[PDB]
Design a protein around this ligand. Structure first.
Ligand SMILES: CO[C@@H]1[C@@H](OC(N)=O)[C@@H](O)[C@H](Oc2ccc3c(O)c(NC(=O)c4ccc(O)c(CC=C(C)C)c4)c(=O)oc3c2C)OC1(C)C
Length: 116
């Protein structure tokens, strides 16, 4: 629906789903990508739950998500993980998953037209 993921799924069920994904997609990182609650410029992505092959750099994900949003060339766009902008993080998602993942095992990201 429209409510954020953590509002729709219990912590238990989210954990259980991450365990399922470890069995069924071992090389992928499970991620939740959501629009900032107070965002007024950027549109809402078609979907919010993704798997990411774990070699993809965070910096590349910024470019991929920006393409998916179909913005104009000048629109501001920031992808935030635990409030940090990912635009210059040329590090595989595998290597930041363990430091930045939620207790439920998903890696959460927020996009917005401003950083702070
Ligand atoms: C509980 O798992 C479910 C799946 O259930 C089962 N039995 O497999 C199924 O219901 C659905 O399956 C999905 C759902 C989403 C993706 C998915 O989003 C994938 N990602 C890519 O193909 C991909 C490849 C390259 C790349 O740079 C990016 C990043 C894309 C950005 C975030 C827009 C993504 C993928 O490989 O597999 C996916 C699969 C198998 O969603 C899950 C994982 C929650």
């Amino acid at each position: 629906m429209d409510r954020p993921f953590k509002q729709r799924r219990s912590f238990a069920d989210r954990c259980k789903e991450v365990q399922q994904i470890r069995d069924q997609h071992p090389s992928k990182i499970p991620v939740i990508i959501e629009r900032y609650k107070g965002e007024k410029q950027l549109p809402v992505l078609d979907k919010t739950k993704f798997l990411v092959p774990d070699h993809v750099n965070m910096s590349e994900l910024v470019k991929i998500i920006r393409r998916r949003l179909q913005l104009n060339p000048t629109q501001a766009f920031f992808l935030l993980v635990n409030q940090h902008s990912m635009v210059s993080v040329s590090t595989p998602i595998a290597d930041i998953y363990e430091q930045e993942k939620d207790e439920d095992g998903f890696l959460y990201m927020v996009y917005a037209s401003q950083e702070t």
